[PDB]
Amino acid sequence: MMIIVGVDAGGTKTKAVAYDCEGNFIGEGSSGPGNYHNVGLTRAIENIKEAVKIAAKGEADVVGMGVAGLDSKFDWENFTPLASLIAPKVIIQHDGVIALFAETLGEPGVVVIAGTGSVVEGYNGKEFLRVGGRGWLLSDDGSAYWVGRKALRKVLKMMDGLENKTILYNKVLKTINVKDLDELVMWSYTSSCQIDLVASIAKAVDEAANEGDTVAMDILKQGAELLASQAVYLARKIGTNKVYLKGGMFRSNIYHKFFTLYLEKEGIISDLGKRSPEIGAVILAYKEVGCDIKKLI
Amino acid sequence: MMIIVGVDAGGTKTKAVAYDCEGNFIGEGSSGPGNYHNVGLTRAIENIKEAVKIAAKGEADVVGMGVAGLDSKFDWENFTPLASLIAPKVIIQHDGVIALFAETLGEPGVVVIAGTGSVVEGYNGKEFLRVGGRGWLLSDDGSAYWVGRKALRKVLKMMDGLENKTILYNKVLKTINVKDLDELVMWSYTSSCQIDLVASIAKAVDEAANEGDTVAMDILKQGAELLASQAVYLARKIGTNKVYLKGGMFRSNIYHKFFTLYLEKEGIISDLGKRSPEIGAVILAYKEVGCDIKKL
Ligand SMILES: Nc1ncnc2c1ncn2[C@@H]1O[C@H](COP(=O)(O)OP(=O)(O)O)[C@@H](O)[C@H]1O
Ligand SMILES: Nc1ncnc2c1ncn2[C@@H]1O[C@H](COP(=O)(O)OP(=O)(O)O)[C@@H](O)[C@H]1O
Ligand SMILES: O[C@@H]1[C@@H](O)[C@H](O)OC[C@H]1O
Ligand SMILES: [Mg+2]
């Protein structure tokens, strides 16, 4: 026997699933962020190692992982060595790769990730191409963090009396446990660089949007179209008329709607896909150790 | 005979000037930052006492100070105690107040301060008002940080090939001494959560704009207009048709123009700051202790 573990290490959570080499599910586990840009190398590795240990219920023989944050030769150099310590055999890819291959099983295609951050990544069958996916300051259009920041800035303007307060106002304050501008200021001193925390506010935006807040809908719409525009670009670029949609942001029905309406308008078909990204990581591990992908899917 | 000192305690540095109650100059001194957020309460206080100490070299009777960093009640509770003991009589206000009074002479008015951050301060004769000025993440529309971020994001888009490269591209990359996408990425992750580095990019945007880059011009325009509209809101709430403009952002001719173009369209006139903040602090003190601002 042998224990194969697939891990999807993101900006909010790290998800791992463990299997046999015979397509038999053994377990699952989850932990905090695996994006070292968000929590530091020690925490990221520790979280990944924890999710793996949990899902495998001990030691794993092989671990395949898709990692958010591997956005430069630099990142790969800093992360690869340490991540390679978690199991005798470890395969490392960008998180966009495992998300796509979970669906295309390795074939050409384009996937859009809208989670804590965002990215549009595709495979030509020869090379991987990506647009965006370079961190919260430089990119991550339409990501949960993007949405969260937009929401926070709007609440402040409502607080300043520059705009009418809407449902969003209370939803957001509650989520971050703030009651007034004074607590918001203090909150900013301590929480401004907590990426997953800012991104968590996206849920509040969705809540408001579902309860009729047009201001929240507007935020979701702008973010969704900004990211979708990039998906259309890479789709034409690669030559495919279909893209897969993955990530926590797509849990927002409104976000998803605006995203697909924009894609449809551009002649692009969207698919939420069938499998989770960690399954794509297991697929990669299987290929690495010779286990048959057929028993898996 | 009284010794009145006005103090401008900014995040970068502190300046204090002394005068008697009859408007006669006594001296001045400078010192390190006054924003305890940038250098810890202990350091800020000692510096403030530094400038004040020399400005009037020795004891001071009254001290009016504009301080950067008191953006919340917590900040006030932290700073005020020690600050109020620097002189027998000490008046404390936001650095925006003295900047405003330096121009209005203590009368009602509105002033826009657009530098690394941005804010609109106003006084209606009875109480001080404010909009924005709440930090890089939540606020600071139209600040150097704000335009710097917009530029960075646009430069990545150009690299990804989502938009045509314009002169702005090279200007931002040269300013942050980056030549690679790999290099850009690592730069952002090192300078991510520290505002000064991002705000410095605003200079490259201005330079691009001056060289005809309409894409750069547009960033300045959207920033200036987002802030300008807050200025309009406060001007109308206070009841004045004019506002004063101060800050490094107004060193950009184009930003200034877009700002004025938008103000005028809204029936509001404006003028650049024509007096130091520390003088506005002396004015704040004068107003509090009954000294004639005209003699000043
Ligand atoms: N219904 C929803 N509407 C909007 N945002 C949501 C919703 N559900 C979850 N999210 C957001 O999506 C994020 C989680 O997405 P996820 O894909 O797991 O990210 P990552 O891969 O970076 O860990 C959180 O930041 C959360 O705020
Ligand atoms: N001509 C200009 N165009 C664009 N930005 C400028 C220009 N001159 C200065 N700046 C920017 O404005 C800031 C300086 O503002 P300043 O008023 O000195 O504020 P602070 O006291 O907070 O440093 C810097 O971030 C700088 O990049
Ligand atoms: O690597 C990408 C990261 O930079 C972004 O923040 O989130 C999405 C990831 O794919
Ligand atoms: Mg993810």
Pick the CATH number of A1-105+274-297 from 3.30.830.10, 3.40.250.10, 3.40.50.300, 3.30.420.40: 3.30.420.40
What span, in angstroms and rounded, lies between the C-alpha atoms of B118 and B135?
8
The neighbourhood of ligand 4, an ion, using CB within 5 A, equals A 10, 115
CB B120 within 8 A of CB B131: yes
Q: Kindly provide the resolution of this structure in angstroms, with one decimal.
A: 2.0
Structure tokens given for B290: 């009954």
The β-bridge partners of A27 are A18
What span, in angstroms and rounded, lies between the C-alpha atoms of B30 and B38?
17
End-to-end CA distance of chain A: 19
Q: Same CATH fold, B106-273 and B1-105+274-296?
A: yes
Question: Amino acid identity of B93?
Answer: Q
What span, in angstroms and rounded, lies between the C-alpha atoms of A296 and A274?
13
What span, in angstroms and rounded, lies between the C-alpha atoms of B60 and B58?
7
Structure tokens given for A236: 């034409």
The β-bridge partners of A65 are A7, A92
Contacts of B122 (CB under 8 A, 6+ apart): B100, B108, B109, B110, B111, B128, B129, B130, B234, B235, B237, B238
Using the 8-state DSSP alphabet, how is residue A121 labeled?
A: E
Q: Is A125 exposed, middle or buried (0-12, 13-18, 19+ CB in 10 A)?
A: exposed
What span, in angstroms and rounded, lies between the C-alpha atoms of B124 and A81?
62
What span, in angstroms and rounded, lies between the C-alpha atoms of A124 and A109?
7
Q: Are the beta carbons of A74 and B132 separated by less than 8 Å?
A: no
Pick from B102, B122, B107: nearest CA to B296: B102
Helix, strand, coil fractions of chain B, as percent rounded to 5: 50, 20, 30
Superfamily covering domain B106-273? ATPase, nucleotide binding domain (3.30.420.40)
What span, in angstroms and rounded, lies between the C-alpha atoms of A232 and A131?
11
**Chain A within 8 Å of B127 (Cβ-Cβ)?**
no
DSSP E strands: which ranges in A71-148?
Answer: 89-94, 109-114, 118-123, 128-132
Q: Is the dihedral of CA B29, B31, B36, B40 positive or negative?
A: negative
If one looks up domain B1-105+274-296 in CATH, what number appears? 3.30.420.40
What span, in angstroms and rounded, lies between the C-alpha atoms of A72 and B145?
24
Contacts of A74 (CB under 8 A, 6+ apart): B182, B185, B186
What span, in angstroms and rounded, lies between the C-alpha atoms of B217 and B162?
19
B203 annotated ligand binder: yes
What span, in angstroms and rounded, lies between the C-alpha atoms of B63 and B85?
10
What span, in angstroms and rounded, lies between the C-alpha atoms of A208 and A24?
41
- Select from B72, B137, B198 the Cβ nearest to the Cβ of A182: B72
Structure tokens given for B89: 């009589």
- Strands laid side by side in the A242-246 sheet: A128-132, A118-123, A109-114, A242-246, A269-271
Kindly list the domain boundaries of chain A, sorted by start residue. Answer: 1-105+274-297, 106-273
Pick from A14, A18, A4, A64: nearest CA to A44: A14
Helix, strand, coil fractions of chain A, as percent rounded to 5: 50, 20, 30
Contacts of B60 (CB under 8 A, 6+ apart): B3, B4, B5, B18, B52, B86, B87
Pick from B7, B27, B21: nearest CA to B95: B7
What span, in angstroms and rounded, lies between the C-alpha atoms of B101 and B277?
8
* Greatest Cα-to-Cα distance within chain A, rounded to the nearest angstrom: 65
**Chain B within 8 Å of A41 (Cβ-Cβ)?**
no
C-alpha of B286 from chain center: 23
